[PDB]
């Protein structure tokens, strides 16, 4: 693998390239300018970005000797042997022509000295320090490192003369992902229909090996679908369609977020009835920044990020969250209400900051904070442990959602049932801009909800739902779902009865008007009139403020 | 491959992903891509993952090398990493082989929660041996764990553990019973349907021990022609989770019919529901006086399906710590939805929910957080594969109007007090296997109840059995005549008027 194999990161590639090559190629310029070049690099970033690949590329391309050092391979049990191994490695490297040394996973070798209990780790840390910096330290020997946890390294190691510059090999952009796809799909025979540009635009958080996994999975899917269809000429008809890549992309997810993946639930924009205005506003707010950033940068403003749905229970806020998670390109991070909390001290805030760090790392991302009544509450409670942690968590939320961060397209979606109990600093614009009220559907909204729910099911040709929609006047989408469930249960009971009678001696491939009439005589109207009074009072107070 | 049952799709996927490189590499040369070289197996302990790995390593010309978790770890510095390097060099020297590293969660402490240096050193050794310069030359590694979340994110990456296989039913359990009883003639009249329906919670590694214990106990009780196990041997092996079958409950015929419908219909006919294209109802809520038979009704509707039974109590989940009750609720729902189907029995909803509202205190905030965790776990960002939440309280007025929302606890079933015709069925169901007298009249005992409960009838039966065992050390009539005077009637009158008012308000709504 040469430099051509590495792609998606041009600045860092140049940074290592110039230092490793130009001093070994034309030292006349350094002799003329009278300064020696830097001789140390520490490559860091999230796992699987291509650090080892770039090291391999420079090793294979440069004519200088390459020596490989692994992290734990040098450690031993005897007293004074790991340091001997390092000395042997360094002296062997320096004995020959100008060379490159690569200490893979240095964070295993060299943690902070003060925060370790052993002794051999301290000795080997000191040995590294002395080897790289000391009397007659190095001569035409370049050292490169790779790690995933830069902060967990001895600060005495992060100085000029040891690791002169710390290049950040982070996730690539859309164009970088485009070149990664083009690089990986260069050897496999592809079909003409698929266009890699759309795939690169669709993928957001995928880094390096994630794209390699995508390509491998698409090829495997193509092979598996052709291998089962058929029992020399088969080799000629080997082509990977756009459908294979779409399958792989739908079934995949970025590595950093794989543990936070949500179970796939099939919901689409047509599956949610009514709420057309709210649906359109949400679509605008979501896909405007991600699909058209050129307009936003032309106008020189940032986009609104946060949204909050509030209203009676069951009206469809979590359904809208599901619909978004299914029908937006950005990554999704779902969280239950108190799911982040912990009994230990200073861990619920660590939980919040880790999830936000992952979200803003794999941007753009939609974080769905469900049931904010638990996390947010109202800061300044009833003293003691009634507020001791409930305030620290809120403060961490505030400072993570707004303050001392880089704007990186992270949209927080809220969902509550009693928003009057939410801390007022959370509701502020710039944290949760939109205060959307999701009211109980009216007659036409209920008709739309019924049609949406009955999308995929047999219906009698002469059956109308207008009577059902109009005969409620107080119901919610959950109640309409309950009516539909009871009707389906009675219809399937009739079907089982008919099947049993036929066996003893499709009878009903559709639901009937009498089935609906029999099912509807026992309805609920779950939302009470006091809750409606409270919600109306809150909404009109909000409008008065408006 | 003939000794694996139930893991059909994952066994076929692992089989093809191993053998398509091994049978012919010309296909991957023509398609111009490299196959995956990592399988992360996760699931409950005792499923059969290492048996499938050994079966794939036996059916193909590989070399199965077994590496254990706690075996390779030591206290000497640089020795466990040396053992891992020696194992990888031994696997790469001779032939293309199959590596099975078992219990990888013990040697992957995620490098941030641990304090030991040797664990981070062997984690870095695994990441170096699995990926790097000339890392692997035609060798695939397999893992095994119980909790796949306590693994490093660089370990769950592509190239190391790029495939995650969920090895978590009745036909597969019957297949395991057929393949584990293949080398022995058990009998002619043994039906495997009861053995596949009664062992509803067997992981797969207990079925072989069950058949071995039955085959051992048959030879033990019979000490070469006409040998083998019978049904009573399997019954004794199962004896070595409730014992009801639609018969111990008395009365409540329409409630029993409604529960039987709304539980057995989504289990027996999934294909008809996919033809209709609709999801069934889940939640049933009971309310009324105590000592009525709600737990017995839940057990009687759980016992006929092939589901499990997780019966948790109200105040047996609240804790003084921060987050412990919600962690217990999440653990209960995860253990419920990790084995489909499963009916969940939440008792004392009035003690759990409390109609959160506003309390302005630490206990009120803990109650609010418990209620929000329950509301998220019942119907939130989940898949609701097969979860039958059944509630049972004695105070429905202290429930918030969010759990009674349809989709969570929509069935507002009232359980009233039984009558004399129902107490006849209760007394007939309790005295199933009892030596009875032809001179006793259960109708004369049931007519003089006038508002008793199932607990009082069980107390009367227990007093009659105590008098019978006192006379012994059939049941006679004077035991019932002397036990009918010492009744209890623990339920008062005002709770019945309050429950009737709540039922009338629910009917008028």
């Amino acid at each position: 693998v040469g430099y051509d194999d590495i792609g998606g990161c041009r600045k860092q590639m140049a940074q290592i390239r110039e230092m490793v090559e130009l001093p070994l190629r034309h030292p006349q310029l350094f002799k003329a300018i009278g300064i020696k070049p830097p001789r140390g690099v520490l490559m860091y970033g999230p796992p699987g970005t291509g650090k080892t690949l770039m090291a391999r590329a420079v090793a294979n391309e440069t004519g200088a000797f390459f020596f490989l050092i692994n992290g734990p391979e040098v450690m031993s049990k005897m007293a004074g042997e790991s340091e001997s191994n390092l000395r042997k490695a360094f002296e062997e490297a320096e004995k020959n022509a100008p060379a490159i040394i690569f200490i893979d996973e240095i964070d295993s070798i060299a943690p902070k000295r003060d925060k370790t209990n052993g002794e051999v780790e301290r000795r080997v840390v000191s040995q590294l320090l002395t080897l790289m910096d000391g009397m007659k330290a190095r001569s035409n020997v370049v050292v490169i490192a790779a790690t995933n946890r830069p902060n967990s390294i001895d600060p005495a190691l992060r100085r000029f003369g040891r690791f002169d510059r710390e290049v950040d090999i982070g996730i690539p952009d859309a164009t970088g992902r485009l070149e990664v796809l083009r690089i990986h799909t260069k050897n496999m025979k592809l079909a003409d229909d698929v266009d890699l540009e759309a795939l690169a635009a669709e993928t957001h958080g995928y880094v390096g090996a994630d794209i390699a996994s995508l390509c491998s999975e698409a090829a495997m899917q193509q092979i598996r679908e052709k291998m089962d269809l058929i029992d020399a000429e088969v080799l000629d008809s080997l082509g990977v369609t756009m459908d294979n890549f779409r399958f792989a992309l739908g079934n995949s997810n970025p590595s950093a977020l794989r543990e936070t993946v949500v179970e796939s639930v099939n919901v689409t924009w047509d599956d949610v009835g009514g709420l057309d205005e709210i649906k359109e506003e949400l679509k605008e707010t979501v896909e405007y920044p991600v699909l058209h950033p050129d307009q936003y940068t032309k106008f020189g403003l940032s986009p609104s990020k946060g949204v909050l749905f509030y209203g009676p229970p069951g009206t469809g806020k979590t359904l809208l969250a599901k619909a978004v998670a299914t029908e937006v390109s950005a990554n999704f991070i779902s969280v239950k209400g108190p799911e982040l909390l912990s009994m230990w001290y200073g861990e619920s805030e660590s939980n919040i900051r880790d999830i936000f760090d992952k979200a803003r790392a794999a941007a753009p991302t939609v974080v769905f904070l469900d049931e904010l009544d638990s996390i947010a509450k109202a800061r300044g409670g009833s003293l003691g442990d009634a507020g001791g942690a409930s305030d620290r968590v809120v403060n961490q939320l505030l400072t993570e959602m707004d303050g001392m961060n880089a704007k990186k397209n992270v949209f927080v979606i809220g969902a509550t049932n009693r928003p009057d109990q939410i801390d007022p600093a959370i509701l502020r614009p710039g944290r949760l801009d939109q205060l959307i009220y999701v009211p109980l559907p009216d007659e036409n909204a209920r008709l739309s909800i019924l049609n949406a729910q009955l999308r995929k099911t047999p219906l009698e040709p002469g059956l109308e739902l207008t009577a059902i929609a109009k005969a409620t006047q107080g119901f919610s989408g959950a109640d309409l779902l309950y009516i539909v469930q009871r009707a389906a249960k009675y219809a399937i009971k009739d079907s089982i009865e008919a099947h049993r009678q036929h066996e003893a001696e499709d009878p009903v491939p559709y639901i009937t008007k009498e089935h609906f009439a029999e099912a509807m005589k026992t309805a609920k109207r779950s939302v009470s009139d006091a809750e409606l009074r409270r919600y109306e009072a809150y909404s009109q107070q909000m409008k008065a403020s408006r | 491959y003939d000794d694996i049952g139930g893991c059909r799709k994952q066994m076929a996927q692992i089989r093809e992903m191993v053998e398509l490189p091994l049978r012919h590499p010309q296909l991957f040369k023509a398609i111009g891509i490299k196959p995956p070289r990592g399988v992360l197996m996760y699931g409950p302990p005792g499923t059969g993952k290492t048996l499938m790995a050994r079966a794939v390593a036996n059916e193909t010309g590989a070399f199965f090398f077994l590496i254990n978790g706690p075996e390779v770890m030591s206290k000497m510095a640089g020795e466990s990493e040396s053992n891992l390097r020696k194992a990888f060099e031994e696997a790469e020297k001779n032939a293309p082989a199959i590596i099975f590293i078992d219990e990888i969660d013990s040697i992957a402490p995620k490098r941030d929660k641990t304090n030991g240096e040797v664990e981070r050193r062997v984690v870095s050794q695994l990441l170096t041996l699995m990926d790097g310069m000339k890392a692997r030359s035609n060798v695939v590694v397999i893992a095994a764990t119980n909790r796949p979340n306590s693994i490093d994110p660089a370990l769950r990456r592509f190239g190391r553990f790029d495939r995650e296989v969920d090895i978590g039913d009745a036909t597969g359990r019957l297949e395991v019973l057929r393949i584990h009883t293949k080398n022995m003639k058990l009998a002619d009249d043994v039906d495997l349907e009861a053995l596949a329906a009664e062992t509803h919670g067997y992981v797969g590694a207990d079925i072989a021990s069950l058949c071995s214990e039955a085959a051992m106990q048959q030879i033990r009780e019979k000490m070469l022609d006409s040998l083998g196990v019978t049904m009573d041997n399997f019954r004794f092996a199962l004896g070595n989770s409730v014992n009801v079958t639609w018969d111990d409950v008395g009365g409540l015929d329409e409630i029993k019919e409604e529960l039987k419908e709304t539980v057995e219909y989504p289990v027996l006919h999934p294909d008809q529901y996919t033809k209709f294209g609709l999801s069934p109802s889940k939640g049933v809520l009971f309310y009324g006086p105590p000592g009525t038979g709600k737990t017995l009704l839940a057990k009687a509707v759980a016992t006929e399906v092939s589901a499990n039974f997780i019966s948790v109590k109200g105040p047996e989940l609240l804790s003084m710590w921060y987050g412990e009750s919600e962690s217990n609720i999440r653990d209960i729902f995860d253990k419920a939805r990790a084995a489909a189907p499963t009916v969940v029995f939440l008792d004392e909803l009035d003690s759990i929910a409390k109609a959160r509202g506003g309390s302005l205190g630490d206990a009120g905030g803990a109650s609010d957080r418990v209620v929000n965790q329950l509301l998220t776990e019942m119907d939130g960002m989940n898949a609701k594969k097969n979860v039958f939440v059944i509630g049972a309280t004695n105070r429905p007025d202290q429930i918030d109007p969010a759990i009674l929302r349809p989709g969570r606890l929509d069935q507002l079933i009232y359980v009233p007090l039984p009558d004399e015709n129902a107490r006849l069925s209760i007394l007939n169901a309790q005295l199933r296997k009892t030596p009875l007298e032809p001179g006793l009249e259960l109708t004369a005992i049931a007519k003089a109840t006038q508002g008793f409960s199932g607990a009082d009838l069980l107390y009367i039966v227990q007093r009659a059995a105590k008098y019978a065992i006192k006379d012994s050390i059939y049941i006679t009539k004077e035991h019932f005549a002397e036990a009918m005077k010492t009744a209890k009637r623990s339920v008062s009158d005002a709770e019945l008027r309050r429950y009737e008012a709540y039922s009338q308000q629910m009917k008028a709504s």
């Binding site: 209990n117 442990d385 | 710590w321 803990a366």
Partner: peptide, 22 residues
């Protein structure tokens, strides 16, 4: 003639954590 060798690898320590009640 034979020879000896010294080796001192590590030991095991104990940490203390703080919890929060409610």
């Amino acid at each position: 003639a034979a020879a000896a060798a010294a080796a001192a690898a590590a030991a095991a320590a104990v940490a203390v954590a703080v919890a929060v009640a409610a």
